[PDB]
């Protein structure tokens, strides 16, 4: 359970992200795909992209980055009271998209890295630890839904 102070650190940096949702979403998906190429393979929509320059030039990838970060921002702003938001997301990601929980760990790393690069003054160690806790809570709660459905592994 995050404390109120931890949530304030999370949402203070997240308010900075929302000034350029699309640039953050590009940076995060590109980092995810470069660091963990198995993740790119899960996207029929993107797996034609073979270089970082091609990824940066894809408007559709930029659009999807906004979709992803909008869903995550709505979850973070619930401060843990996010059951209604996680139900459909766990269902799609477990049963339709077939995304292992481990790949959610990978995107969480990519998010933390990009936030550190773009917002160092608001993303010191205290805020890094709080965002790590928030993303752990996200993964814990999604993993419980995966397990219900027979996909935790
Ligand atoms: C912070 C974590 C993530 C969030 C908030 C998120 C959110 C979303 C949302 C909102 C959609 C569209 C609605 C839906 O299908 O449920 C979507 C689609 C999708 N997501 Fe995620 N996602 C996350 C992580 C991942 C990861 C790590 C992968 C793959 C490694 C992935 C793969 C996909 C795929 C394949 C689609 C469908 C894309 C398409 O063909 O339109 N997601 N995601």
Curated annotation (Swiss-Prot):
Superkingdom assignment: Eukaryota
Catalytic activity annotation: Fe(III)-heme b-[protein] + nitric oxide + H2O = Fe(II)-heme b-[protein] + nitrite + 2 H(+); H2O2 + AH2 = A + 2 H2O
Positions where Phosphoserine occurs in the chain: 3
Positions contributing to nitrite binding: 64
Modified residues (Phosphothreonine): 67
Positions that bind heme b: 93
Protein EC: 1.7.-.-, 1.11.1.-
InterPro entries recorded: Globin, Globin-like_sf, Myoglobin
UniProt GO MF annotations: heme binding; metal ion binding; nitrite reductase activity; oxygen binding; oxygen carrier activity; peroxidase activity
Signal sequence range: none
Domain Globin: 1-147
GO CC term (a single one): sarcoplasm
Residues that hold O2 according to the record: 64
GO biological process, one term: removal of superoxide radicals
Keyword set, alphabetical order: Cytoplasm, Heme, Iron, Metal-binding, Muscle protein, Oxidoreductase, Oxygen transport, Phosphoprotein, Transport
Subunit structure: Monomeric.
Function: Monomeric heme protein which primary function is to store oxygen and facilitate its diffusion within muscle tissues. Reversibly binds oxygen through a pentacoordinated heme iron and enables its timely and efficient release as needed during periods of heightened demand. Depending on the oxidative conditions of tissues and cells, and in addition to its ability to bind oxygen, it also has a nitrite reductase activity whereby it regulates the production of bioactive nitric oxide.
Name of the protein in question: Myoglobin
UniProt lineage: Eukaryota, Metazoa, Chordata, Craniata, Vertebrata
Gene name as annotated: MB
């Amino acid at each position: 359970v995050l404390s109120e102070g931890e949530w304030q650190l999370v949402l203070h940096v997240w308010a900075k992200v929302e000034a350029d949702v699309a640039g953050h979403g590009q940076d995060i998906l590109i980092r995810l795909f470069k660091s963990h190429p198995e993740t790119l393979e899960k996207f029929d929509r993107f797996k034609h992209l073979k270089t970082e320059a091609e990824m940066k030039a894809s408007e559709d990838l930029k659009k999807h980055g906004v979709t992803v970060l909008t869903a995550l921002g709505a979850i973070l702003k619930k401060k843990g009271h996010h059951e209604a938001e996680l139900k459909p997301l766990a269902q799609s990601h477990a049963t339709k998209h077939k995304i292992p929980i481990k790949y959610l760990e990978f995107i969480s790393e990519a998010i933390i890295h990009v936030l550190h690069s773009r917002h160092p003054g608001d993303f010191g160690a205290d805020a890094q630890g709080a965002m790590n806790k928030a993303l752990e809570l996200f993964r814990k709660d999604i993993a419980a839904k995966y397990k219900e459905l027979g996909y935790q592994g």
